[PDB]
Amino acid sequence: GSKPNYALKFTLAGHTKAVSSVKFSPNGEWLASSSADKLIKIWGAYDGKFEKTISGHKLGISDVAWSSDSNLLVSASDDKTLKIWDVSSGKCLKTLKGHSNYVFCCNFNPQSNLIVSGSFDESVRIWDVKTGKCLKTLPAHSDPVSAVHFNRDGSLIVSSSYDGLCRIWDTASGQCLKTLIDDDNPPVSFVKFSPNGKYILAATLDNTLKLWDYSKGKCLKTYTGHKNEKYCIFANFSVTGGKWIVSGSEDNLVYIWNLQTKEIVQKLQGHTDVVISTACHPTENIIASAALENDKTIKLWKSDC
Ligand SMILES: Cc1nc(CO)c[nH]1
């Protein structure tokens, strides 16, 4: 139908501190979760079945991300490292050392030969997956880096920061192509490219999501109604059914907007703390949501539309 009807199907318990991130594997079979409890957990995407715990970080994890082939994970930790993991063996393949403060955010490129990271040390680093070596350190921002993401062909990186900027980087050279958002404030708490790489979705800590045209550097859409003044809350393009924007909220709800009309089309109730992370299944109309330490659960929601 014209609106979704997401309904709670499973609650996934086991983390002992706040959940920080949830991500579906590109092949759709898994959900990965990261937590302040220093653990990664792997769950069945369709039935929430607990699969395994992946351990090794010495402090909390703020983010986890899948390789394009669903075989590897990368995690970003307060221990100042990222780790590359073989999901099947659960083994740490590489530890990526160089950041001088907490690593907050990470992603593979589509090729999955590179990892990008953002840190409280105000830098963005680009890493070689095969060797675990740091290829480039970008002096990207003047405050902690909240998000990093590659576009569809891997040629661009978008970064965001508490400094109030969103910057687009040439992967190959590390050089800045554009400062897309250029304000002293508000802090930019999240950014990512649209699936086709033409748009950037940006969150600011003034309860606002905006959809930007990268090429023209202009705001096309604004989404409001939710609460976001403190946390770096993920947002998503939902593309399997109707074309939605999805975000967590500091009022403990998942918000779903019509991307084109900007109308709120659903609010998902059930969590008992801030919903810091949401993920959209690559093929099925399924949302994963995760909450902070009063809750510590992941919820799987399913829609007909
Ligand atoms: C908690 C968290 N938010 C982000 C957004 O990039 C990374 N980790």
Numbering used by the authors: 30 to 334
From the publication, what sentences describe this entry?
A “cellular multitasker” with many binding partners, the scaffolding protein WDR5 is best studied in the context of histone methylation as part of the SET1/MLL (mixed-lineage leukemia) complexes. WDR5 comprises a 7-bladed β-propeller fold, each blade composed of a four-stranded antiparallel β-sheet (the WD40 motif).
Removing the methanol moiety entirely leaving 2-methyl imidazole also reduced binding (6, KD = 2.1 mM); however, this aligns with the reduced size of this compound and the high ligand efficiency of 2 is largely maintained (LE = 0.60).
